[PDB]
Write an enzyme that holds these catalytic residues in place. Structure first.
Site, PDB file in Angstrom:
ATOM      1  N   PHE A 170       0.539   0.636 -10.057  1.00 20.26           N
ATOM      2  CA  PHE A 170       1.477   0.608 -11.129  1.00 20.26           C
ATOM      3  C   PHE A 170       2.074   2.002 -11.488  1.00 20.26           C
ATOM      4  O   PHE A 170       1.261   2.866 -11.612  1.00 20.26           O
ATOM      5  CB  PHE A 170       0.978  -0.237 -12.371  1.00 20.26           C
ATOM      6  CG  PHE A 170       0.800  -1.779 -11.772  1.00 20.26           C
ATOM      7  CD1 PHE A 170       2.039  -2.439 -11.279  1.00 20.26           C
ATOM      8  CD2 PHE A 170      -0.491  -2.233 -12.218  1.00 20.26           C
ATOM      9  CE1 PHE A 170       1.648  -3.769 -11.181  1.00 20.26           C
ATOM     10  CE2 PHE A 170      -0.462  -3.864 -11.584  1.00 20.26           C
ATOM     11  CZ  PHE A 170       0.566  -4.411 -11.190  1.00 20.26           C
ATOM     12  N   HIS A 188      10.466  -6.540  -3.316  1.00 21.77           N
ATOM     13  CA  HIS A 188       9.386  -6.156  -4.432  1.00 21.77           C
ATOM     14  C   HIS A 188       8.286  -5.698  -3.635  1.00 21.77           C
ATOM     15  O   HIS A 188       7.538  -6.272  -3.015  1.00 21.77           O
ATOM     16  CB  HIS A 188       9.159  -7.011  -5.510  1.00 21.77           C
ATOM     17  CG  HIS A 188       7.979  -6.513  -6.558  1.00 21.77           C
ATOM     18  ND1 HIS A 188       8.423  -5.288  -7.339  1.00 21.77           N
ATOM     19  CD2 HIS A 188       6.894  -6.526  -6.381  1.00 21.77           C
ATOM     20  CE1 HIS A 188       7.396  -4.901  -7.841  1.00 21.77           C
ATOM     21  NE2 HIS A 188       6.564  -5.733  -7.574  1.00 21.77           N
TER      22      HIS A 188
END
Lengths: 389, 388
Positions: free
Chosen positions: B213, B302
């Site tokens: 992330f 994504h």
């Protein structure tokens, strides 16, 4: 073949209508006249005698008769950190509302779907709104699962929205229904005050006001354009326009923070004064294009954030006492259920209209207005048209 | 009549993406150096086997660089954010309630500049984040920071997750198409201060998040009926937008906001679930258009991690070139949650222009954009390119 041809086939033809309304509340409830005694006892604050008197006056002034509350006395006895003014308690609160908010939403949705009378497979979109907890996947997903909707429903999850969001979900649903042929939108607002319940502090009277006003409830709608009469669809209200604005000089009027102590509530400015001083601008923007200037000729739905908002709007505009009847009935019988309130008020209005035998679902009148009020200070303004009875 | 009012109120044509702007925290980490940094700053250097596992996670991630608002200096001052599980939500919120709209503003200023129109012409704001919550929300803060009209119609999308880059496109599509003159400012802004935490050898799924992330924001202007007389020009046009929940996927990805911040939890096989089912989303989207050759599309997916991309490529028989733009953004920025697919759109149209190909979609006509996230949810947006 062309993108233009695809677009025109894809979209709906007419205005979005509210086809069904269902509501639900926790069974457990408190009578407002008895709440100061209960609240100061369960929060072990009976020694705060001056503050208890202030809270009695807040409860008396609220005009609320009854509030539904998922939180019970027995649960709070087991969870004294939720009865403290400010103890670490978010995890416990979340554990409650991530389950109970979609469950209460489902209860309202089942009723709306029953009224609508169509198979649940015809639901194409889900709009879920709450100010009570957050999780991933969200309450939108949980509702979809609980109801057994098609996995390919198009979902929108509106979290941490606040008190204006009953208007917001109408504005959302309007664009979803109108831009998509055949679309049928399940709208659910579900609020459970376990995230905001806390003990009293005489240095935070704004928090204390919240403990007098806020309550639990859920409301569900089916919204769609191009109703199919042959299968028993029938609009109750039609949406015409939806607007949103931030009031001038209102910075910080209403703030809410999600912290380790749960959701906290802060008031810094005169909210009824701000709303009443500025509401005509929103009425003119909405109704000048329709040639309407007599606000007593409209049917009214206003978010009942507290009675002072209603009283000051009524005085400022010279509204007849009857105009806020539906709004005040919901405030009296249910309290401030945040985003769900205005949808309960639509239900009250169309039901009373039918009982009284008047000409339309909007108290016999053609045009109406729905207001959401909340943090910003934000005002949502929805123009409605009634349907004949 | 109401029908007449409705016709006059709505827009005529498909929603287009008229501008794209992106931003990231200036601070960044190189992935090659992250295992050493991370295990040092989280006081976990004694966890020898676990560090080796993390090194392999970072090596296989295919990420080169990640931008991070959180600095070493800040983390040294806040050991409770470096713990695996310590009370820390308040600290995290204090960061992201300020920084998420700030980063969003930086991206929005760039989009607005590209668009070239007065900011007073913005009618709607859609703000999306998975990083913190507040009332009023980041949508309000952005409106204030940019000095937009007080009567912008705002939608605040909180705690959305990784699929929501698709979600904001789906939202903006309906806003723009149903409202004549509407110009929608869309912002996705993600800051991983809410998820950063130390390692635990019994929660390797949490550890994966620490490898992937990253922070970033992307902004769009979306509108129908582009006005060439003021210099508007779409980059991509949206044709349809869908959302679905994959079968047998319940609990694959959960995320909870707790006193310790945002925690993530993985079960099941996410690359497997996505790759096994994605053809059903492609068929639903493209069969009505008469399209069945998935290599004939330009692709945006994504990049939740490299295994998703690899297994989709294999399952569908995609040429290696199809995922180039997607993988470039994963390499250079990491998994910025909802913002990723919008960075990938920007990468694709910029590379297309630099290469001199025929359209903004790598010279191809039709394209597809996928968001993947908790549910397991798949968002599917059909796009049409514009000639260059």
């Amino acid at each position: 073949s062309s993108l233009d041809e695809i677009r025109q086939a894809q979209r709906a033809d007419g205005p979005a209508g509210i086809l069904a309304i269902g509501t639900a509340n926790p069974e457990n409830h408190v009578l407002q006249a008895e709440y100061p005694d209960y609240y100061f006892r369960i929060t072990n604050s009976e020694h705060m005698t001056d503050l208890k008197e202030k809270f009695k006056r807040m409860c008396d002034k609220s005009t609320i008769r009854k509030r539904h509350m998922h939180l019970t006395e027995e649960f709070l006895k087991e969870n004294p950190h939720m009865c403290a003014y400010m103890a670490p308690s978010l995890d416990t609160r979340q554990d409650i509302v991530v389950v109970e908010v979609p469950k209460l939403g489902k209860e309202a949705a089942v009723k709306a779907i029953k009224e609508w009378g169509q198979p649940k497979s015809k639901i194409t979109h889900v709009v879920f709104c709450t100010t009570s907890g957050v999780d991933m996947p969200g309450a939108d997903y949980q509702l979809t699962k609980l109801l057994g909707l098609r996995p390919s429903v198009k979902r929108l999850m509106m979290y941490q929205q606040g008190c204006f969001a009953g208007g917001t979900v109408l504005r959302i649903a309007k664009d979803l229904a109108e831009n998509n042929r055949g679309a049928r939108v399940l709208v659910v607002c579900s609020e459970i005050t376990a995230v905001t319940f806390r003990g009293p502090s005489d240095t935070h009277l704004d928090s204390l006001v919240g403990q007098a006003l806020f309550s639990d409830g859920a409301a569900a709608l089916i919204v769609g354009s191009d109703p199919d009469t042959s299968v028993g669809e029938k609009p109750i209200f039609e949406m015409v326009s939806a607007a949103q604005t931030i009031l001038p000089d209102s910075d910080g009027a209403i703030d809410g923070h999600l912290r380790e102590v749960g959701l906290t509530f802060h008031l810094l400015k005169d909210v009824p004064g701000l709303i009443s001083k500025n509401i005509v601008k929103s009425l003119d923007e909405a109704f000048k294009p329709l040639g309407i200037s007599d606000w007593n000729s409209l049917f009214w739905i206003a978010h009942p954030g507290g009675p002072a908002i209603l009283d000051q709007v009524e005085i400022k505009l010279g509204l007849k006492e009857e105009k806020m009847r539906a709004t005040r009935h919901v405030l009296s019988e249910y309290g401030n259920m945040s985003s769900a309130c205005v949808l309960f008020i639509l239900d009250e209005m169309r039901r009373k209209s039918a009982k009284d035998g008047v000409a339309t679902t909007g108290e016999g009148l053609e045009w109406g207005v729905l207001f959401g009020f909340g943090p910003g200070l934000t005002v949502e303004t929805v123009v409605l048209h009634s349907v004949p009875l």
